[PDB]
DNA sequence: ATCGGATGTATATATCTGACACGTGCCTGGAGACTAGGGAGTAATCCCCTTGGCGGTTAAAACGCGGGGGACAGCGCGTACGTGCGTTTAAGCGGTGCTAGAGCTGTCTACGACCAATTGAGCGGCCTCGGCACCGGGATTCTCGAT
DNA sequence: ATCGAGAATCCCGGTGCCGAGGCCGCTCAATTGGTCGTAGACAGCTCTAGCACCGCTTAAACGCACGTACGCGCTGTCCCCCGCGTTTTAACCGCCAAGGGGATTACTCCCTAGTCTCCAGGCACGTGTCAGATATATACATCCGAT
């Protein structure tokens, strides 16, 4: 079964980290990623790095575990990375705070909101899924995913881990219709066809791992392209797997956020309510507002709007 | 212009083989034949409203052709849609 | 289960009670007669419309909502009833 | 391949078209789904009717020695038809006249 | 012996039966008509009651407004008696004929 | 010094009118009261000639069948003239009010 | 188009008319009421054919909106279009 | 916490039924946002006119219930009610007590 | 069976019309079917000039067409007036 | 009863002509093959709603029997409506021009889409006390016999 | 035009009885969630059909004179419908029983929407061409004013 801190003592390695710098129940489930499940209280299980593991955490440190051994040093690398760990979250809520005096409200109560490194293909495709729909739902349809289409890890208790799907999986014979018994809705045409547009008509792999190095302008106007994939999907890409700090997600959320918690309204825009041009304008307000790293500042308030 | 024209024209060689129509009258029968179509298939579409379904098969079209025919008129015409059918199903 | 002659049920005082409903003040002899065909004639036109949509629905009974519908169909539209 | 196409008005033995009223029946959004016999259904219908109009309008144009049918002559067999007045009672026929009838006690003294 | 105007009585009937609601028509014998008339169409078929007051009602309806009608044509006859000339009338001005 | 008795030619022309089928009301005229009525719903509405044609007909059409109810109703009281009493007698059978 | 348009369907067009319709005589009372009551039925009419007409977003009345209009009132007209 | 669209827009006949029966009555495909709106609130200013009218006519007859007499009664007195409706009958409802002049003694 | 009608929503406005008076089960019955035949007329004409403009959809002008077609005289006025009342609040969230 | 004058149609013939009928070009709506799934046909059930019977009471239908009053036939009159005609006018008919809107195209802001949680009103079950039919009585107003 | 007996009608209070409405239970029905793809609203643009205007011509309106037959008033005649009293009767209400069919529910299957790939049936377009309009000339059908 899945181990827990208590339970199996030599089988857990820490790596220095303050509730303050990160708080796994404000991260794992917030939309950011949704392959994290709490099997056990306080313990969150997924895939990091095609391989299994069981995250818990102290006041001061960050716990990690066929596994027989305590994570290698090299193995736990891959974890702060995926945390990005280099970034310290405290000099960011003190910036954005100093700025914002909404912001450092809502930063008391919620500390730790950080952004998570991400792999390409698994953000765009989850995403593809996250469009008109809510998290509770997304998260079963990516694991129907995954278990369909991925490599099979390996088994705890009842539940069998799956690596996800790659782009020549996804782009297979019959997938839609496949996604669909597995109810995908129409986002089951998204998945098939943006898979099949990547590796036949933009070059594979290759195209979405350069976009890492493009500017965000750039990466956002490549991803476009894709079905399944407008405004919203292609920031939430840019910002949580292609290190585009300064993207801004807008969603119904963050519609919201502005309206009452800044008495926000469109200025250059024509419509009075969300329009791709009222939405574009939102995400530049926001960037002026926070700066470079306004993303990770609306990772913060949405995580915390989600807590209603 | 979607229209009846040469149709009616067809049949009025079946009927009159030599006998013309005028424009005026090919309008009248065009304007006709658009009428009854709209009164059989919204009476129909009230019967398959009725009963809970949501087909329009034959027996309802009979139904609507039995309630907006009068009377001998009604029994001619449900002939001929029988014999028709009959003869889409076995051909 | 034969019925015969059942035209006659209808009273001539029911014909004159519905005439004085109607405003009529006096009453020919002639009128029972003429009274007891047109509504002959109407419940022929209401019943057959009525047994027809019966007939449709594969039942054996004639119930309120086939009434309701002759009726509408031959422009009464009765509320009420269903 | 293909085994040629031929109408369904032509395997139905009809002349009005059963495809064109099938697609009207379906874009004419009268029911969710549309069987397949209901169109051909209603084109026999109506080919019934159109004939049955057709014929008294050109005994009427005969009586009347013309050869081409005119809307004067649509008006005479609808409305010298009883059932067919019954049927289009309440339709106004363009360029149509009226029948001839005149009351009894007008005409004069015999 | 004291005996009233024979159009008095007339008028207070019309009174009478323009103030209430009531039916005015024995349910049974009508149901028998109503049956008699449907045998005709369909063999052993059966009736709801509530179609049954349902067909009441609209006859009743019906009559009431022939009557209506038809004491208009004969009062325009410059009559009060009305004769089945003024119904026959009062159908063909209709339209039922 | 010839002339006709009344009611000859008057009765005829009825058979010269039921023969035609032309409109008997000019067209001009009726164009202007279209347009007359027209101006009280919008202002300044345009009109196709096949409008006001069809206007015309449907109007002719209305006004014969009723003084067809006009001479039925006139025929009624033993009377061969027509009067407005028949006009209103004919609309409130058939329901116009 | 302005006022006095009324009296464009003079006497002899209204006995034309009834002489089509089966009138013998004519007293010289009908004439008024005639043509009060071709203007009740037009502006009846003409009423439905203008909202059709607004609904559609235009300014010029086409024959097929009166045919419609007229199809509303029982009044179906054939020859105009469908 | 829902609000609903009926106190949204500030009727009481469900918006949302209205809005189901327009879908599923096949009356188009597609149907916009603020007809159901819109046919709700011309069903409220109906029904408001009639019961009004209803309950003016039951408290005439010292009555504290609406009878078919009553509803009746109300259609036929009222003018534009009485054209809307012209064509119908109301069960159990009696007519418009109503004499014709000449039937009057002299 | 789940017999859906208006009765409470009659009743409601009832409430706020004559807030004293009574409503028999007839009534109410009669009530019902009024709203279902004035409803049925509408949706009819609404969706009937959705095919004659070619339209693919209903919005809210054409309920306000249908309405001035069929309510005669001051209703259509009020009706009118309501709707656009009730339509401008709802849009006015 | 009848007879020709005179209108008013019926009938027959020459001579255009513009709607009618035909062939042709072309494309777009119809057709053939194939697939997935849900509307619908079919079997079992229960319960309930319909039909039928039986009997007692009596409101109501049937029927006779005046008698008055309203339908109705006949006669007179005077006036309002027809027929005919000279005069006016305006309605078609035919151009000619003006142009504002009708209709077809090319761009981008409001609904459909999949459906699962989420309440939360909306209907079913079930009291319950009050609105109102009914009775019992007495007083008021209409109605027709009398002067 | 009143008086007044007498009959139909209106007002007041008591009685009880069932149903309109309130309350609770339970349950499906609008509502919404990290949006995007997509049809309708809008601007653009052509061109045509509707508007105005004028001149010519002649068919229709019409103002008027005149005669006559129709509507209307008035009358007496008579027959037939209504009020009323008496005599059946079968409608109605209450109760009871039996079972036919009509909602239901579960199950399967096959008919049809959707889609891809064609192709010829039918819609513009052009052109001969004769049925019918139309003018002309004769045949006779029928009112009708005497006769």
Same mark, same amino acid.
């Given at each position: 079964?899945?181990?827990?801190?208590?339970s199996?003592?030599?089988?857990?390695?820490?790596?220095?980290?303050?509730?303050?710098?990160?708080?796994?129940?404000?991260?794992?489930?917030?939309?950011?990623?949704?392959? %994290?499940?709490?099997?056990?209280?306080?313990?969150?299980?997924?895939?990091?790095?095609?391989?299994? %593991?069981?995250?818990?955490?102290?006041?001061?440190?960050?716990?990690?575990?066929?596994?027989?051994?305590?994570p290698?040093?090299?193995?736990?690398?891959?974890?702060?990375?995926?945390?990005?760990?280099?970034?310290?979250?405290?000099?960011?809520?003190?910036? %954005?705070?100093?700025?914002?005096?909404?912001?450092?409200?809502?930063?008391?109560?919620?500390?730790?909101?950080?952004?998570?490194?991400?792999?390409?293909?698994?953000?765009?495709?989850?995403?593809?899924?996250?469009?008109?729909?809510?998290?509770?739902?997304?998260?079963?349809?990516?694991?129907?995913?995954?278990?369909?289409?991925?490599?099979?890890?390996?088994?705890?208790?009842?539940?069998?881990?799956?690596?996800?799907?790659?782009?020549?999986?996804?782009?297979?014979?019959?997938?839609?219709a496949?996604?669909?018994?597995?109810?995908?809705?129409?986002?089951?045409?998204?998945?098939?066809?943006?898979?099949?547009?990547?590796?036949?008509?933009?070059?594979?792999?290759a195209?979405?791992?350069?976009?890492?190095?493009?500017?965000?302008?750039?990466?956002?106007?490549?991803?476009?392209i894709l079905?399944?994939?407008?405004?919203?999907?292609?920031?939430?890409?840019?910002?949580?797997?292609?290190?585009?700090?300064?993207?801004?997600?807008?969603?119904?959320?963050? %519609?919201?956020?502005?309206?009452?918690?800044?008495?926000?309204?469109?200025?250059?825009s024509?419509?009075?309510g969300?329009?791709?041009?009222?939405?574009?304008?939102?995400?530049?307000?926001?960037?002026?507002?926070?700066?470079?790293?306004?993303?990770?500042?609306?990772?913060?308030?949405?995580?915390?709007?989600?807590?209603? | 212009?979607?229209?009846?024209?040469?149709?009616?024209?067809?049949?009025?060689?079946?009927?009159?083989?030599?006998?013309?129509?005028?424009?005026?009258?090919?309008?009248?029968?065009?304007?006709?034949?658009?009428?009854?179509?709209?009164?059989?298939?919204?009476?129909?579409?009230?019967?398959?409203?009725?009963?809970?379904?949501?087909?329009?098969?034959?027996?309802?079209?009979?139904?609507?052709?039995?309630?907006?025919?009068?009377?001998?008129?009604?029994?001619?015409?449900?002939?001929?849609?029988?014999?028709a059918v009959?003869?889409?199903?076995?051909? | 289960?034969?019925?015969?002659?059942?035209?006659?049920?209808?009273?001539?005082?029911?014909?004159?009670?519905?005439?004085?409903?109607?405003?009529?003040?006096?009453?020919?002899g002639?009128?029972?007669?003429?009274?007891?065909?047109?509504?002959?004639?109407?419940?022929?036109?209401?019943?057959?419309?009525?047994?027809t949509?019966?007939?449709?629905?594969?039942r054996?009974?004639?119930?309120?909502?086939?009434?309701?519908?002759?009726?509408?169909?031959?422009?009464?539209?009765?509320?009420?009833?269903? | 391949?293909?085994?040629?196409?031929?109408?369904?008005?032509?395997?139905?033995?009809?002349?009005?078209?059963?495809?064109?009223?099938?697609?009207?029946?379906?874009?004419?959004?009268?029911?969710?789904?549309?069987?397949?016999?209901?169109?051909?259904?209603?084109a026999?219908?109506?080919?019934?009717?159109?004939?049955?109009?057709?014929?008294?309008?050109?005994?009427?144009?005969?009586?009347?020695k013309?050869?081409?049918?005119?809307?004067?002559?649509?008006?005479?067999?609808?409305?010298?038809?009883?059932?067919?007045?019954?049927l289009?009672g309440?339709?106004?026929?363009?360029?149509?006249?009226?029948?001839?009838?005149?009351?009894?006690?007008?005409?004069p003294?015999? | 012996?004291?005996?009233?105007?024979?159009?008095?009585?007339a008028?207070?009937?019309?009174?009478?039966?323009?103030?209430?609601?009531?039916?005015?028509?024995?349910?049974?014998?009508?149901?028998?008509?109503?049956?008699?008339?449907?045998?005709?169409?369909?063999?052993?078929?059966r009736?709801?009651?509530?179609?049954?007051?349902?067909?009441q009602?609209?006859?009743?309806?019906?009559?009431?407004?022939?009557?209506?009608?038809?004491?208009?044509?004969?009062?325009?006859?410059?009559?009060?008696?009305?004769?089945?000339?003024?119904?026959?009338?009062?159908?063909?001005?209709?339209?039922?004929?």
């Open positions: 079964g899945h181990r827990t801190l208590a199996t003592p030599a089988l857990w390695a820490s790596i220095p980290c303050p509730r303050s710098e990160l708080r796994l129940d404000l991260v794992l489930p917030s939309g950011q990623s949704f392959r %994290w499940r709490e099997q056990s209280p306080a313990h969150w299980s997924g895939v990091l790095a095609d391989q299994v %593991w069981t995250l818990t955490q102290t006041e001061e440190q960050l716990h990690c575990t066929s596994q027989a051994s305590r290698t040093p090299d193995e736990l690398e891959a974890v702060r990375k995926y945390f990005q760990l280099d970034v310290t979250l405290a000099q960011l809520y003190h910036h %954005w705070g100093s700025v914002d005096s909404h912001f450092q409200e809502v930063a008391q109560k919620f500390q730790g909101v950080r952004l998570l490194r991400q792999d390409p293909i698994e953000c765009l495709f989850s995403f593809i899924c996250s469009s008109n729909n809510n998290i509770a739902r997304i998260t079963g349809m990516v694991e129907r995913l995954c278990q369909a289409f991925g490599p099979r890890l390996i088994q705890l208790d009842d539940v069998t881990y799956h690596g996800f799907p790659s782009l020549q999986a996804l782009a297979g014979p019959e997938v839609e496949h996604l669909r018994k597995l109810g995908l809705g129409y986002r089951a045409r998204y998945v098939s066809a943006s898979a099949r547009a990547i590796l036949e008509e933009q070059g594979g792999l195209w979405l791992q350069q976009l890492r190095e493009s500017s965000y302008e750039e990466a956002h106007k490549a991803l476009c079905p399944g994939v407008g405004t919203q999907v292609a920031d939430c890409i840019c910002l949580m797997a292609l290190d585009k700090p300064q993207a801004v997600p807008v969603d119904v959320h963050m %519609w919201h956020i502005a309206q009452r918690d800044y008495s926000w309204h469109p200025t250059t024509q419509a009075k969300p329009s791709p041009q009222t939405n574009k304008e939102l995400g530049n307000f926001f960037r002026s507002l926070w700066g470079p790293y306004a993303g990770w500042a609306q990772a913060v308030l949405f995580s915390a709007d989600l807590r209603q | 212009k979607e229209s009846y024209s040469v149709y009616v024209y067809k049949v009025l060689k079946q009927v009159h083989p030599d006998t013309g129509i005028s424009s005026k009258a090919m309008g009248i029968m065009n304007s006709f034949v658009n009428d009854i179509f709209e009164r059989i298939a919204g009476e129909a579409s009230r019967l398959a409203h009725y009963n809970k379904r949501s087909t329009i098969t034959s027996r309802e079209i009979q139904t609507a052709v039995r309630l907006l025919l009068p009377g001998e008129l009604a029994k001619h015409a449900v002939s001929e849609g029988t014999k009959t003869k889409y199903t076995s051909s | 289960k034969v019925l015969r002659d059942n035209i006659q049920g209808i009273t001539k005082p029911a014909i004159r009670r519905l005439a004085r409903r109607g405003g009529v003040k006096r009453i020919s002639l009128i029972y007669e003429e009274t007891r065909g047109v509504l002959k004639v109407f419940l022929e036109n209401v019943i057959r419309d009525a047994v949509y019966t007939e449709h629905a594969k054996k009974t004639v119930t309120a909502m086939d009434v309701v519908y002759a009726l509408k169909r031959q422009g009464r539209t009765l509320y009420g009833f269903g | 391949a293909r085994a040629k196409a031929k109408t369904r008005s032509s395997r139905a033995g009809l002349q009005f078209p059963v495809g064109r009223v099938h697609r009207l029946l379906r874009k004419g959004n009268y029911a969710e789904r549309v069987g397949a016999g209901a169109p051909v259904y209603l026999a219908v109506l080919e019934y009717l159109t004939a049955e109009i057709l014929e008294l309008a050109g005994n009427a144009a005969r009586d009347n013309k050869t081409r049918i005119i809307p004067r002559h649509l008006q005479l067999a609808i409305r010298n038809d009883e059932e067919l007045n019954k289009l309440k339709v106004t026929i363009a360029q149509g006249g009226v029948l001839p009838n005149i009351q009894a006690v007008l005409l003294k015999k | 012996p004291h005996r009233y105007r024979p159009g008095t009585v008028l207070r009937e019309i009174r009478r039966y323009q103030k209430s609601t009531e039916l005015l028509i024995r349910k049974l014998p009508f149901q028998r008509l109503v049956r008699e008339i449907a045998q005709d169409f369909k063999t052993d078929l009736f709801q009651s509530s179609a049954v007051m349902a067909l009602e609209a006859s009743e309806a019906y009559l009431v407004g022939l009557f209506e009608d038809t004491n208009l044509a004969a009062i325009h006859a410059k009559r009060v008696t009305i004769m089945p000339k003024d119904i026959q009338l009062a159908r063909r001005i209709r339209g039922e004929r």
